Amino acid sequence: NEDNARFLLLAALIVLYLLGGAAVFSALELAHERQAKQRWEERLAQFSRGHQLSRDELRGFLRHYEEATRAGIRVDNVRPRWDFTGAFYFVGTVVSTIGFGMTTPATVGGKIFLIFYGLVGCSSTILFFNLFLERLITIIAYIMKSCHQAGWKPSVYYVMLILCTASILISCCASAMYTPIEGWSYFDSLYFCFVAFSTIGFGDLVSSQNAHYESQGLYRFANFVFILMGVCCIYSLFNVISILIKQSLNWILRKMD
Amino acid sequence: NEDNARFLLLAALIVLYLLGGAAVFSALELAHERQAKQRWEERLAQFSRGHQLSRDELRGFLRHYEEATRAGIRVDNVRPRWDFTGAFYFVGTVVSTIGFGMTTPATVGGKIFLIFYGLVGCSSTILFFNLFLERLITIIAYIMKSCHQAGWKPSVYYVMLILCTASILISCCASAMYTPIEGWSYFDSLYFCFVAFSTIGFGDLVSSQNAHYESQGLYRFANFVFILMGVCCIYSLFNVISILIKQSLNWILRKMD
Ligand SMILES: CCCCC/C=C\C/C=C\CCCCCCCC(=O)O
Ligand SMILES: CCCCC/C=C\C/C=C\CCCCCCCC(=O)O
Ligand SMILES: CCCCCCCCCCCC
Ligand SMILES: CCCCCCCCCCCC
Ligand SMILES: CCCCCCCCCC
Ligand SMILES: CCCCCCCCCC
Ligand SMILES: CCCCCCCCCC
Ligand SMILES: CCCCCCCCCC
Ligand SMILES: CCCCCCCCCC
Ligand SMILES: CCCCCCCCCC
Ligand SMILES: CCCCCCCCCC
Ligand SMILES: CCCCCCCCCC
Ligand SMILES: CCCCCCCC
Ligand SMILES: CCCCCCCC
Ligand SMILES: CCCCCCCC
Ligand SMILES: CCCCCCCC
Ligand SMILES: CCCCCCCC
Ligand SMILES: CCCCCCCC
Ligand SMILES: CCCCCCCC
Ligand SMILES: CCCCCCCC
Ligand SMILES: CCCCCCCC
Ligand SMILES: CCCCCCCC
Ligand SMILES: [K+]
Ligand SMILES: [K+]
Ligand SMILES: [K+]
Ligand SMILES: [K+]
Numbered sequence: 001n002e003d004n005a006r007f008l009l010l011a012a013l014i015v016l017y018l019l020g021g022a023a024v025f026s027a028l029e030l031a032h033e034r035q036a037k038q039r040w041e042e043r044l045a046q047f048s049r050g051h052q053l054s055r056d057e058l059r060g061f062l063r064h065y066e067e068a069t070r071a072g073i074r075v076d077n078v079r080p081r082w083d084f085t086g087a088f089y090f091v092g093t094v095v096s097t098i099g100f101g102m103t104t105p106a107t108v109g110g111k112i113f114l115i116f117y118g119l120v121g122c123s124s125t126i127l128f129f130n131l132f133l134e135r136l137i138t139i140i141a142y143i144m145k146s147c148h149q150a151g152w153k154p155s156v157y158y159v160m161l162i163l164c165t166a167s168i169l170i171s172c173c174a175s176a177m178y179t180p181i182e183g184w185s186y187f188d189s190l191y192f193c194f195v196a197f198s199t200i201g202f203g204d205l206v207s208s209q210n211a212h213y214e215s216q217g218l219y220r221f222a223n224f225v226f227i228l229m230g231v232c233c234i235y236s237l238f239n240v241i242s243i244l245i246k247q248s249l250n251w252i253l254r255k256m257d
Numbered sequence: 258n259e260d261n262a263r264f265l266l267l268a269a270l271i272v273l274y275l276l277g278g279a280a281v282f283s284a285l286e287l288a289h290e291r292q293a294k295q296r297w298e299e300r301l302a303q304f305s306r307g308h309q310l311s312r313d314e315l316r317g318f319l320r321h322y323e324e325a326t327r328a329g330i331r332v333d334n335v336r337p338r339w340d341f342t343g344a345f346y347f348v349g350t351v352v353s354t355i356g357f358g359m360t361t362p363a364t365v366g367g368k369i370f371l372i373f374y375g376l377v378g379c380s381s382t383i384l385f386f387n388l389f390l391e392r393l394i395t396i397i398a399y400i401m402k403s404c405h406q407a408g409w410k411p412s413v414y415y416v417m418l419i420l421c422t423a424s425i426l427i428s429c430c431a432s433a434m435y436t437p438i439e440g441w442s443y444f445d446s447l448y449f450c451f452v453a454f455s456t457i458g459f460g461d462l463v464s465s466q467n468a469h470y471e472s473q474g475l476y477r478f479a480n481f482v483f484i485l486m487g488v489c490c491i492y493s494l495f496n497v498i499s500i501l502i503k504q505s506l507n508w509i510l511r512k513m514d
Contacts, residue, residue, distance in 0.1 A: 003395075007388055014381060018352070021374055022344035028367045029339040033328060036363075040325035047318055051310065062332050064300050065319060070461070071293035075319050082286040087279035095275065099457040101358055106293075110285045111448050117278055118455060123498035124271060130499075131264050138260075191368050198375060200356040203460060204327070241380040242387075 006249055072103070077211045085220070089208075092224070095121040096231060098201040102209065133236045156243060163237040170233060171197070174226040178207060181219070197230035198238075263506055328363065334468040342477070346465075349481070352378040353488060355458040359466070390493045413500060420494045427490060428454070431483045435464060438476070454487035455495075 048055060072081045080086060081103050090103045094117070105111050137159065145152040175189035184192070184205070192205040208223050305315060329338045337343060338360050347360045351374070362368050394416065402409040432446035441449070441462075449462040465480050 003388075003392065007392060010381070010385055010388065014352075014378075014385065017378060017381070018345065018348050021348045021378075022341060024370065025347060025362075025367065026339050026341050026344040028370070029344075029362065029364065032364050033337075033339050036325070036328040037330065040321070040328070040330055043321050043325075047321075051308070051314075053308065057308075059332060061304055062322060064297070064304075065322070066332060068293070068297035068300075071297060072290060073294060073297050075316065075323060080290075082283055082290045084279060084283055087283040087286075088275065090282060091275050091278045094457065095271075097354075097455065097457050099356065099452075099459050101458075101460040104459050104461045105282075105286065107286065107289050108444070110282065111444075113281065113285065115448070115451050118451075118457065119498075121271075121274060121278075122455065123495045124267070124274070124502055126495055127499040127503055128267055128271065131260075131267065135260065135264060187365070187368075191372075194372050194375075195356075198354065198379065199456075200351065200354050200375065201358075201458065202356050202361050203358040204361045238380045238383055241376075242384040245381055246384055 002253065005253060009249060009253065071106075078209050079211050091117075092227075093201070094118055095125050096199060097122055097125075098196065098199050098231075099203075100201050100206050101203040102206050129232060129235050132232050133239065136236065156240060160237070160240045160244070163233060163240060167197070167230070167233045167237060170226070170230050174230065177222065177226075181214075182207065182210075193230065196227060197234040199231060199235075259510065263510060266510065267506060329360070336466045336468055336470075348374075349484075350458070351375055352382050353456060354379055354382075355453065355456050355488075356460075357458050357463050358460040359463050386489060386492050389489050390496065393493065413497060417494070417497045417501070420490060420497060424454070424487070424490045424494060427483070427487050431487065434479070438471075439464065439467070450487065453484060454491040456488060456492075 044058075047053075048058060072078075082090075086103060093100050093103075094114070105114050137154070140154055140159065140162065141152050144154060171190060171193045174193050175186055178184060178189040178192070179186050182189075188205065192207070195202055195205070208220060213219055301315075304310075305312065329335070339347075343360060350357050350360075351371070362371055394410070397411055397416065397419065398409050401411060428447060428450045431450055432443060435441055435446045435449070436443055445462065449464070452459055452462070465477060470476055
């Protein structure tokens, strides 16, 4: 009966959390959306009136451009898709369940292979993350025992603090490189780092997609290393916080009578 | 020493898997990409020649259109963002780490709140999935014991088979709709179902945004229910397959002596 009660309580809390977040986000973003839409409408009217064009022709042209954008054509000199390096980037985003969306299959035959490839690879990546967390806990215990000098296993709180510090340090180090090389601001770099490391992957900001990129040999290697370490650390942090939340739910159930 | 060897072996296998997948995907998609690019170039040249517009003006117009698209403007009629239900959809995609990308924050203040909101919600969702898997295993054991009529826990193989069957059934039932409602093909519907249920979320196909949507009350409820069940089942399947892969790694390590 305890397990069922815990399940039901967690479901109700998640529902309330979703409702509150929806209200807050709407209140934050509605006015900016409306202003942007009005600005676009004014620009489109100005362009249509300037060159004595018609709106149906512009609609057809924009539909063709949407198709071209889906194909991969951009406005500012992007790197080619579906070469060996681009395919490596695509499979890297697929196996980690990030899914930026900058490159997607378009043919029948590529989609079946995507289904089977992902089905086989995602589980292996999850196993890799679990083994990494176990190794990190073991090395932390060994270091603590050696410094004091099995039963020296650290508590959950200290592991959480260490993971938080490591995540912050890695994010700052990665942003310090993303900021100059790209045309991004520091806060935007931190936002991109959080979105990528959590395996959410909105796709609004994607790195290493500018055709000629100076050295271009070390940059891709550094990008790969940074993304891998960030994903591992953030996943471990999520698991530890989930354990703590479960303990809190147990306390809430015990208190209520 | 065994743990370190298993870690190293898994890393090497994943690297080889990535290389092979990259080669196959490139060989599958390069020609289609090139054909699409040539088609777009021909269309753009035709339009520019026809309407006597210079290249730079068209480039500026397309840059403005990209800026407008980033805020939610489309050539077809779509539902507004950030009213109250778009926010519900956005937070639902955020907490489950799907990240379609059809709606993203654009203001300073909405990005910090996103960071903290996701940090707190993703762990709760992971805990919910784990509790669901435990409950499903327990109910399977109880049903098996009752049919035969603790020590009646099923093997991993039977759980994997049951999860596979449930995933296939849910995917087919969900694809029964989305086919006439949005005018998709059946294979495209299955592809979208797999991409969404695995929490990859490319964003090329997104459901339930066409402004007027007939009933629009039951359709959203059904969409929510279907996505929730699919995500739960596919995550459970991933965990079981990871356990099996770990057993296989142990076997091959033992064989190597
Ligand atoms: C060596 C350890 C093996 C484990 C690998 C597991 C998962 C891969 C995870 C993340 C890779 C992120 C994609 C970045 C690729 C960029 C390459 C480029 O910019 O061209
Ligand atoms: C009642 C169980 C509580 C647990 C909820 C946990 C996670 C939510 C997961 C998936 C929902 C994503 C789909 C959002 C669709 C919104 C519906 C619409 O407007 O089209
Ligand atoms: C341009 C870089 C493409 C290849 C980079 C992958 C390097 C991974 C091999 C080292 C880990 C064992
Ligand atoms: C238009 C639909 C918005 C609200 C739908 C959410 C329904 C889930 C709440 C009931 C389950 C506890
Ligand atoms: C005792 C059974 C009560 C039902 C619990 C399930 C509620 C959540 C379903 C999504
Ligand atoms: C006992 C050896 C543990 C190996 C740790 C691997 C390094 C992790 C951070 C790069
Ligand atoms: C151009 C400045 C780039 C600095 C990157 C090095 C950060 C330290 C990593 C250990
Ligand atoms: C222009 C310098 C870009 C590469 C810096 C990263 C060096 C490797 C650090 C691991
Ligand atoms: C003896 C342990 C050497 C470290 C193995 C791990 C190296 C790959 C980590 C990415
Ligand atoms: C003992 C009852 C636990 C609830 C099982 C139902 C989960 C699936 C509902 C769709
Ligand atoms: C037009 C929709 C026909 C299919 C709806 C039935 C879905 C299966 C519900 C169990
Ligand atoms: C036009 C009918 C669309 C809604 C069908 C789904 C009914 C709810 C089934 C759970
Ligand atoms: C905690 C509930 C938030 C208020 C809901 C508003 C619905 C219009
Ligand atoms: C462009 C090919 C690079 C190959 C990397 C080395 C493979 C181990
Ligand atoms: C065009 C045939 C592709 C086959 C995909 C791989 C099947 C497992
Ligand atoms: C170890 C380097 C700390 C991060 C430097 C930040 C510089 C903007
Ligand atoms: C241009 C290739 C760079 C390879 C980096 C070194 C690999 C260990
Ligand atoms: C198993 C595939 C070997 C790597 C192929 C490299 C092709 C450039
Ligand atoms: C429990 C139902 C929440 C209120 C629904 C609001 C729909 C506009
Ligand atoms: C300017 C409003 C910021 C709201 C987010 C604060 C996070 C605790
Ligand atoms: C239980 C319904 C099976 C799926 C029907 C498919 C009809 C196109
Ligand atoms: C239009 C509102 C539909 C609500 C579905 C029933 C909720 C249990
Ligand atoms: K994900
Ligand atoms: K994702
Ligand atoms: K995504
Ligand atoms: K995306």
